[PDB]
């Protein structure tokens, strides 16, 4: 078929010719080669597809037009906008209640593609009342009766409904969707668990009120369980949601610490995947930025040596998160805890990073060493620390920063040299 032929057929009076033309359009759109979505949009065929979506009499045309509109909305934002402007969102929401599962799930697919474009189309889909039907589909007493493919499609559409920011997902949709996500987190299918963890991650990435909403449901233990799964597609979003949660209040970080999350961090910090390592080190950093008892929990789990090792022998992107962990640890820790950090061998690997080209990280490192010097002052072992720093090559590297890398670093490095090394 050609675009002109399908245009003539879709506008024909025969319902059979209309169905044939819609089939040809769907086949052009589902043909793996670069679809001609732009041409089909310029043909004025989207309104005809939207009208077909309402033909309860003809299930084939409903399915074919929904498929074609799904494939059209899977492209650029302009094409998704063409679908949305054609009034496709209400039509798909109406189809959600279709007696045919294939059309209902094709509508779920299309609504997912639309809500994935951005936050505006997501808020529109929520505005036209798609949340409750979509969630009704999953509510079936036995979620196993709902085929794993259909359940995955529904979970993915819901994840897109919890995705994106500015504006953040509306409260009316989140208060509806969270319990279903709690239910789905207890399924045995990996592809559903990954999407559910990703949705929770989206929801926990923002104000502490949303983190508190997610926490008050009691799912943090199940997220910690998934944290130690063998499947990296599931571990990535779970580690990520936990890292987001630990960016909130001390009660929330204590919810995470109580769920036994720290027990998994020896494996995450020693993980081959560099992104897992970096995100776990960032989580450790935000945990060492908490109460003294939380830092003591980090120490009790024996994670300080692991941090020393990621600071000493890792990539720079993870070494920076290790530096942040060290700085927060020294900023909020007891004198005993800082003595422990030093006795674990943090001085040399921390100062061996002053040779980098990041003014920010250099200033943070210098703040850390200043905190350690303050602890020494409280202990009466300032000169011992000066000697140790000098012998580890520390004084040399702090002096090298007097080359006005930045006036900030110059004055910071000058302050230390005069206070303790002059």
């Amino acid at each position: 078929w050609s675009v002109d032929d399908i245009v003539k057929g879709i506008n024909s009076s025969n319902v059979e010719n209309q169905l044939q033309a819609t089939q040809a359009a769907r086949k052009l759109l589902s043909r793996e080669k670069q679809p001609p979505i732009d041409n089909i949009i310029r043909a004025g065929l989207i309104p005809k597809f939207v009208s077909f979506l309402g033909r309860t009499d003809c299930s084939p045309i409903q399915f074919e037009s929904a498929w074609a509109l799904t494939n059209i909305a899977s492209g650029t934002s302009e094409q998704t906008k063409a679908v949305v402007d054609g009034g496709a969102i209400p039509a798909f929401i109406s189809l959600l209640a279709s007696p045919h599962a294939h059309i209902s799930e094709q509508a779920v697919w299309a609504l997912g593609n639309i809500a994935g474009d951005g936050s505006v189309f997501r808020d529109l889909v929520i505005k036209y009342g798609a949340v409750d039907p979509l969630l009704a589909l999953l509510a079936v007493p036995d979620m196993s009766s709902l085929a794993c493919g259909y359940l995955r499609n529904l979970t993915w559409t819901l994840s897109n409904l919890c995705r994106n920011k500015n504006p953040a997902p509306p409260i009316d949709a989140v208060e509806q969707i969270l319990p279903t996500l709690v239910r789905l987190l207890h399924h045995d299918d990996p592809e559903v668990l990954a999407d559910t963890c990703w949705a929770i991650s989206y929801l926990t990435d923002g104000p502490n009120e949303r983190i508190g909403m997610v926490v008050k449901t009691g799912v943090v233990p199940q997220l910690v369980k998934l944290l130690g799964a063998s499947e990296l597609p599931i571990v990535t979003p779970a580690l990520r949601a936990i890292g987001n949660i630990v960016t909130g209040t001390d009660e929330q970080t204590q919810v995470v610490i109580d769920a036994g999350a720290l027990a998994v961090f020896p494996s995450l910090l020693t993980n081959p995947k560099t992104n897992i390592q970096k995100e776990a080190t960032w989580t450790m950093s935000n945990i060492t930025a908490g109460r003294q008892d939380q830092i003591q929990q980090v120490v009790n789990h024996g994670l300080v040596p692991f941090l020393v090792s990621v600071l000493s022998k890792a990539d720079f992107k993870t070494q920076k998160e290790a530096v942040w962990a060290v700085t927060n640890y020294t900023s909020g820790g007891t004198v005993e805890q800082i003595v422990y950090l030093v006795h674990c061998g943090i001085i040399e690997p921390l100062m061996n990073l002053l040779t980098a080209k990041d003014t920010k990280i250099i200033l943070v490192i210098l703040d850390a060493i200043s905190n350690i010097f303050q602890a020494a002052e409280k202990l009466g072992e300032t000169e011992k620390l000066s000697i140790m720093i000098e012998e580890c090559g520390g004084l040399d590297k702090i002096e090298a920063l007097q080359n006005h890398e930045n006036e900030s670093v110059y004055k910071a490095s000058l302050s230390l040299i005069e206070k303790y090394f002059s």
Binding site: S30, P35, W109, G116, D117, N160
Partner: peptide, 25 residues
């Protein structure tokens, strides 16, 4: 010494799910 603030994340897209999907055959 005073406790430091918690650093909110920086979003990454290393293995994010697909924002849009296409049905094919």
């Amino acid at each position: 010494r005073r406790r430091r603030r918690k650093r909110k994340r920086e979003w990454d897209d290393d293995d994010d799910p697909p924002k849009k999907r296409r049905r094919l055959d």
